[PDB]
Design a protein around this nucleic acid. Structure first.
Ligand SMILES: [Mg+2]
Ligand SMILES: [Zn+2]
Ligand SMILES: [Zn+2]
Ligand SMILES: [Zn+2]
Lengths: 607, 192, 54, 46, 57, 115, 171, 105, 100
RNA sequence: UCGAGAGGA
DNA sequence: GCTCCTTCTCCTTCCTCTCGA
DNA sequence: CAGGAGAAGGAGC
């Protein structure tokens, strides 16, 4: 955090787009195809995983940006896959759109009129028009009158949405709430449920076979019925690859902007981009930068082991399917196909399954049971050991002291007792202006260990000049130029930040874990109690915190800006937390000795 | 993010509306302690007078607009009482439902107003011959006391409503004084 | 690098630019030196040899 | 569950306008309830 | 290998030894006082699998 | 309280690798202040007040002309109880390589001690 | 003819030391350090500024209601306001024949100073066949000396360095 | 002041034009120049810029290994936690492009 | 310059359609606790960064106490922009409010 | 960097 | 065309230390 | 060692 440098811009909203390989190949900086991560010398070998163009290193520099590792954010690479591979996130949707497609007409199996009306309903569900989304079922009157039906439905939807956009019902970019989302999810679930039943085609009457998967990757193609093959020849069990599936679903999606501009976009699509099957399929694995894959300092990163397995399979296929094609198609004829092409039905398992283990590590291949299977990218996000509930929600912070707590009824109920350990250690950044020159000259003169004092001085240029090694006359000389500013053009509107000690003016936060309710965390004015180590309080607080004194510990958080210390004194101080909002009842009054004192003192026989 | 907005409505983050008034009265649960303690607030009257300062709250506060409406609501209320709620049809709105309770002095919830008028019914002798305290002055004090003790626009009442149910569940001892059939009790009931 | 308080954050254009005549140069760009009596002083010290030749 | 709800969130091209506290803590701008339910502006002379 | 078994506790078996758990057989005999050290030689229990089970009989 | 630190220099050798780092000093220049806590055979004297960062063992490297030194680990100012020197269970083809220092830390009754 | 005027809508940050004179605050904070500099959004060199009309975040305010509300950042005390202002930009695009200043004629280069603003350095191969240096002055295809001023074309605008490098050939 | 301004306050920089935090590196200047921030996705190759009226030398910048690029100028500095950048680089391996719509446009 | 000026007028029109004049404001003139805290904090940061102090403080180094002293005569030039849920914002100055 | 154990509230 | 009896396919308090890979 | 819950497909209705 800083105050001398204000944050100029402002993040407003977050969109969830998809990288495809056309974006990634223009995007990335280095292709990674080499398992030679480090040589026998130990140096980074280019083309490999710890390449110098994917960021800096310890003694090295970056080949892409050319800066030191303090200033290099790292750049991301792309593994050119041999085969278009399934993205293991998007797999069941691909399984739905493949199992509910017609191989011949390259539309869906279901009839086109129902597809057009689900398109119109899910277009009405983008401007929130649920007033019109059920009026459309009341439009019902062959070969050509159905075209008039679809044209009249389309112009009905057009006039409805144009009327709603003419007045102030809906703004330019739609409206999307919980009611809209509930109706949309229910309709899309009913749509994909109806698509899985109509096996016989409603556009040609032909037959596409049933699919059934084993685990994740294997797709057994079930043999047809006798009458279905008969009906196929009247109108006129097998593993299947991903390139055939890519071609089938691409040919489906190129004919189907209509309904899939509306299933896959719950907003008014401004730029009107298309729906490819390339969103489902992967062509480049984007390898993260250097500073997110560094080893422990020594064990290397286990992400690099799975990237090395993927590149081992990638170099096996660069061996085989490049060095077999240069061979003749006549000499490689009969007995060179029951072994070599029994290996491409075994080397595509290991390019798909290793990307699966790289991302969705549950779907994998078995083994004799060992220590620990390696986590993926999904496994580094999901739980308390993940990322959201471990590094975005629950963080470990600076400027937060901790000790044991102690009784002290000689300090007020809004006061905290600070031992001089923490009175020396924790600092606060006050600026320098002539209303606060006396205490800051005296604080720099007193130095890092004579409380009230100061440990650091931040210049107008942002340099943290520390006062630790400096002598007595190398602190008394600095307070004679804090007052005079510089002739700098950029920083004639700033002042030096003296990082003074915590003193009797400040206020901390206090926090006892676990916090079952919001009265277990308050704000306390500061008293520094000399020559101790424990933090200590009055007894009014010790019913709110559920605190006995058999060794309890509390996290004194010391806020660093003027905003929070202006909010810890008004909105969360102890004087505004008397009544808990559970029942409006008090929880803060005196305890054990004071009650039997008040019984004896207020009794009639005390003269 | 479920909180209190400037239209005094319990509205979520984007704008999904959960309630129209907080609980029925837009009051704060902390600051509603001695409001229905009328016998207490009759006493200490000058203390609350110098506390509340009504004379500095004249110009920025439309006074009698809700006061004319509220007496008509109450007379139509006592006009039709013995009929049940399905026979008791609705003619016009309650006092808070039409007028903003933090801008119109006298826009008061119905049950608090009923307890106020019943207390001022049954204890006229305490008003008459104790300190000469006027009934109209006491009523026009409690109309300000109901308005100063109102919930703030901005308070995260969703967090508070979560924590005031999650925390007393920790006081539930797992043994059950059940036998006398049976019924699911405690956190096995509150999670269900 | 420079911060968010020396040179402004976002600069766009509102209208396409339009030329000025020779005699309309010194309507303010002469009184700019008549009123301000390196980033400001050498500015006009080099403007003495730019706008005068027109 | 993240990747189920993340799977659903990509397959809608879901714009998110940073409404809830959790999303405004992940992005880190300000939180809506309490103090951040309004803004502050400054009158100046001329 | 027997020193590895006593140094970590992770039982490496080819037949499971007709037990339930895998880890946690050896505990470090601490000597902070004589009571803690004399305690460890009379410390018996059911198992380490039952500590995760939430039904408490 | 009795701590123990088992400092050895056999962490970078395998299969008869020659002794790279010897206990003691070398014949270069070196800051001369290290003698206040260290004997001239690398080891510290018994019973020495050592705060944070002050040396606990010194070794002369043979390679880089460096007398690289072991610094004190924690922050509690301890006293040197023992300096024990373990020989090698091989046929002593190596020199001294294992020093198991003890440390003594005072525990006065202080504010917070759970009686 | 390259003294052009352009209206721009910039977006300045205002310091709390000038919450009482924001006109001179932005004139000293952002506009003065844009004098005699290249800019990536106008492509020119700014000579003068006029017409600082700061917008207001009050949509119902006027030009005489000078209660100019300026928005405060949630963390820092700095303001961020929109402004419309006219600039006197000097910029060539391709080959503008304008007069020049020469301090010393030299042998392998010439070194024109463009009206005491920037440089117009001329390389080796840009010196033609007829022009050769003599041992500093030039005897060109005329054979007689000329005035100290010199007109010259514009080749390319190079803004990577500390100043703008403008090249020009003389054919 | 307890979950952003202490732990991992990272005043990063986003391209305004494409909206991604991960990409926009530093430029590599010549000696006697300055190094600004330029994007990578929106910036395009210098070898493809001569497709066509004449191109001024403004969008042209250079990387470390010498591949001259054209464009990608629109970047500006925001303030995010660093775990946001770690999240973006963890999601890009799954094939997801977060876009960060940033005003002032 | 056509498209940017066009979108500028678009955004200013969509903001002015939300702006509510002083003939209509249906919010209470009591400062809540939150508005008092943020006004004291923001005036503390402004006085901390060389603002002209509108009070003659008598030996004060805490800038928050300088802000709490300037509120006594309402010499705090700030304006609260109260946000209704659809962005329809009202302007209340500090010197038009019931300071509680 | 991960598992096993000990202990405080 | 419609329905039920199995699967898949899911998910959950703060702190300190040591031991060992 | 839970603890039921949601979704899905063919064997009967
Ligand atoms: Mg305790
Ligand atoms: Zn780099
Ligand atoms: Zn068909
Ligand atoms: Zn870009």
């Amino acid at each position: 955090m800083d105050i001398s440098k204000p944050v100029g811009s402002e993040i407003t909203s977050v969109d969830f787009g998809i990288l495809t390989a056309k974006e990634i190949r223009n995007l990335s900086a280095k292709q990674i195809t080499n398992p030679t991560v480090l040589d026998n010398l130990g140096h980074p070998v280019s083309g490999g995983l710890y390449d110098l163009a994917l960021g800096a290193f310890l003694r090295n520099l970056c080949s892409t940006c050319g800066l030191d590792e303090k200033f290099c954010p790292g750049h991301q690479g792309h593994i050119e896959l041999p085969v278009p591979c399934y993205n293991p996130l998007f797999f069941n949707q691909l399984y739905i759109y493949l199992r509910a497609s017609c191989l011949f007409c390259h539309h869906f199996r279901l009839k086109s009129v129902e597809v057009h009306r689900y398109a119109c309903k899910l277009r009405l569900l983008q401007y929130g028009l649920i007033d019109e989304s059920y009026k459309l079922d009341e439009i019902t009157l062959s070969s050509t009158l159905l075209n008039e039906l679809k044209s009249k439905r389309s112009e009905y939807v057009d006039m409805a949405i144009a009327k709603a956009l003419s007045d102030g019902r809906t703004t330019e970019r739609g409206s999307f709430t919980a009611t809209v989302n509930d109706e949309r999810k229910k309709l899309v679930h009913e749509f994909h449920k109806k698509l899985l039943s109509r096996g016989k085609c409603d556009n040609c009457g032909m037959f596409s076979p049933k699919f059934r998967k084993d685990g994740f990757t294997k797709i057994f193609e079930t043999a047809l019925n006798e009458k279905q093959i008969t009906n196929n020849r009247v109108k006129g069990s097998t593993y299947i690859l991903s390139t055939e599936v890519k071609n089938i679903l691409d040919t489906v999606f190129r004919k189907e902007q209509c309904v899939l501009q509306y299933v896959f976009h719950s907003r008014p699509n401004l730029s009107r981009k298309l729906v490819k099957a390339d969103s489902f399929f992967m062509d480049v694995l984007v390898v993260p930068p250097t500073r997110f894959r560094l080893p422990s300092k020594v064990h290397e990163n286990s992400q690099n082991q799975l990237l090395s397995k993927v590149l081992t399979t990638s170099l096996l296929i660069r061996d085989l399917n490049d060095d077999l094609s240069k061979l003749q198609k006549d000499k490689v004829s009969l007995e060179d196909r029951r072994v070599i092409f029994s290996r491409l039905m075994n080397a595509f398992v290991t390019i798909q399954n290793d990307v699966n283990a790289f991302i969705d590590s549950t779907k994998a291949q078995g083994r004799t049971s060992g220590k620990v299977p390696i986590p993926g990218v999904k496994q580094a996000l999901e739980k308390k050991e993940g990322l959201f509930r471990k590094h975005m929600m629950g963080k470990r912070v600076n400027y937060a002291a901790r000790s044991v707590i102690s009784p002290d009824p000689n300090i007020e109920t809004n006061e905290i007792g600070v031992p001089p350990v923490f009175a020396v250690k924790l600092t606060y950044p006050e600026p320098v202006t002539a209303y606060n020159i006396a205490e800051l000259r005296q604080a720099v003169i007193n130095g890092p260990d004579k409380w009230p004092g100061a440990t650091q001085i931040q210049n107008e240029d942002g340099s943290l000049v520390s006062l630790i090694g400096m002598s007595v006359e190398q602190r008394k000389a600095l307070a004679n130029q804090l007052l005079t500013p510089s002739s700098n053009v950029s920083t004639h509107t700033l002042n030096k930040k003296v990082y003074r000690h915590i003193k009797n003016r400040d206020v901390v936060l206090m926090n006892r874990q676990p916090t079952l309710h919001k009265a277990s965390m308050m704000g306390h004015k500061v008293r520094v109690l000399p020559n101790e180590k424990t933090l200590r309080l009055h007894y009014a607080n010790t019913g709110a915190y559920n605190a006995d004194f058999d060794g309890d510990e509390m996290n004194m958080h010391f806020p660093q800006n003027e905003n929070a210390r202006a909010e810890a004194l008004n909105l969360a101080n102890t004087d505004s937390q008397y009544l808990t909002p559970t029942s409006g009842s008090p929880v803060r009054g005196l305890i054990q000795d004071h009650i039997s004192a008040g019984v004896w003192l207020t009794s009639k026989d005390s003269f | 993010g479920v909180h209190v907005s400037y239209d005094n409505s319990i509205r979520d983050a984007d704008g999904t509306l959960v309630q129209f008034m907080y609980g029925g009265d837009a009051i704060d649960i902390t600051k509603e302690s001695h409001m229905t303690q009328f016998e207490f607030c009759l006493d200490n009257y000058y203390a609350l007078l110098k506390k509340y300062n009504p004379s500095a709250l004249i110009e920025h506060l439309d006074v009698e607009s809700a006061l004319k409406y509220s007496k008509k609501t109450l007379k139509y209320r006592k006009k039709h009482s013995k009929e049940p709620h399905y026979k008791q049809s609705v003619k016009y709105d309650p006092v808070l439902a039409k007028y903003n309770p933090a801008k119109y002095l006298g826009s008061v919830s119905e049950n608090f107003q009923d307890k106020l008028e019943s207390f001022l019914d049954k204890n006229s002798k305490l008003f008459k011959s104790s300190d000469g305290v006027n009934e109209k002055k006491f009523r026009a004090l409690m109309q300000l006391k109901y308005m100063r003790s109102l919930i703030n626009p901005g308070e995260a009442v969703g967090i508070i409503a979560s924590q005031s149910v999650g925390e007393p569940s920790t006081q539930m001892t797992l043994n059950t004084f059940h036998f006398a059939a049976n019924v699911t009790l405690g956190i096995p009931r509150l999670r269900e | 690098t420079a911060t968010t308080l020396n040179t402004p954050v976002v600069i766009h254009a509102t209208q396409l630019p339009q030329h000025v005549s020779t005699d309309e140069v010194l309507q303010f760009l002469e009184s700019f030196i008549d009123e301000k009596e390196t980033n400001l002083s050498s500015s006009i010290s080099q403007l003495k040899r730019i706008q005068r030749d027109f | 569950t993240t990747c189920q709800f993340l799977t659903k969130a990509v397959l809608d091209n879901e714009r998110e306008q940073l409404d809830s506290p959790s999303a405004r803590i992940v992005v880190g701008k300000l939180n809506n309830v309490g103090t951040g339910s309004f803004d502050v502006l400054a009158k100046v002379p001329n | 290998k027997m020193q590895y078994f006593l140094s970590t506790g992770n039982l490496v078996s080819q037949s499971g030894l007709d037990l339930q758990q895998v880890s946690g057989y050896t505990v470090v005999a601490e000597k902070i006082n004589f009571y803690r050290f004399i305690s460890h030689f009379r410390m018996v229990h059911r198992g380490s699998f039952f500590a995760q089970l939430k039904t408490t009989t | 309280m009795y701590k123990t630190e088992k400092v050895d220099l056999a962490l970078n050798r395998n299969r008869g690798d020659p002794i790279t780092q010897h206990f003691g000093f070398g014949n270069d220049e070196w800051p001369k202040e290290w003698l206040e806590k260290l004997d001239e055979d690398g080891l510290p004297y018994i019973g020495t007040y050592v705060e944070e960062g002050d040396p606990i063992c010194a070794y002369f490297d043979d390679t880089l002309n460096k007398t690289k030194i072991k610094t004190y680990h924690s922050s509690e100012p301890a006293y040197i109880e023992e300096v024990n020197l373990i020989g090698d269970e091989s046929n002593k083809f190596q020199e001294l390589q294992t020093v198991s220092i003890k440390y003594r830390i005072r525990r006065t009754p202080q504010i917070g001690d759970k009686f | 003819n390259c003294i052009v005027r352009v209206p721009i809508a910039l977006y300045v940050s205002l310091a709390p030391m000038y919450l009482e004179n924001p006109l001179q605050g932005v004139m000293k904070q952002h506009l003065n350090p844009l004098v005699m500099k290249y800019n990536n959004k106008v492509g020119g060199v700014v000579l003068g500024y006029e017409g600082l009309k700061i917008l207001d975040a009050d949509p119902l305010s006027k030009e005489d209601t000078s209660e100019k509300l300026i928005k405060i950042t949630p963390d820092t005390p700095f303001g961020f306001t929109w402004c419309h202002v006219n600039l006197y930009v000097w910029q060539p695009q391709v080959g503008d024949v304008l007069e020049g200043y020469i301090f010393i004629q030299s042998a392998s280069h010439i070194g024109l100073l463009i009206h005491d603003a920037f440089n117009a350095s001329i390389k080796k191969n840009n010196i033609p066949v007829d022009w050769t240096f003599v041992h500093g002055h030039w005897v060109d295809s005329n054979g007689e000396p000329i005035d100290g001023k010199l007109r010259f074309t514009v080749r390319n605008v190079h803004t990577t360095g500390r100043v703008v490098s403008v090249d020009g050939t003389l054919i | 002041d307890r979950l952003l301004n202490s732990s991992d306050y990272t005043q990063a920089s986003v391209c305004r034009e494409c909206g991604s935090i991960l990409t926009t590196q530093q430029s590599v200047p010549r000696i006697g120049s300055i190094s600004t921030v330029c994007c990578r996705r929106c910036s395009m190759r210098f070898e493809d810029a001569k497709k066509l009226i004449f191109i001024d030398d403004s969008q042209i910048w250079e990387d470390g290994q010498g591949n001259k690029f054209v464009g990608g100028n629109e970047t500006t500095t925001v303030a995010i936690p660093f775990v946001l950048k770690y999240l973006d680089s963890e999601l890009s391996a799954m094939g997801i492009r977060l876009r960060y719509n940033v005003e002032p446009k | 310059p056509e498209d940017f000026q066009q979108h500028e007028q678009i955004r200013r029109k969509t903001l002015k359609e939300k702006a509510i004049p002083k003939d209509q404001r249906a919010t209470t003139p009591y400062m809540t606790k939150y508005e008092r805290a943020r006004i004291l904090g923001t005036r503390a940061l402004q006085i901390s960064m060389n603002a002209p102090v509108f009070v003659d403080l008598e030996g004060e180094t805490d800038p928050l106490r300088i802000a709490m002293k300037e509120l006594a005569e309402k010499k705090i030039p700030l304006v609260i922009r109260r946000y209704l849920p659809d962005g329809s914002f009202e302007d209340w100055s500090v010197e038009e409010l019931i300071v509680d």
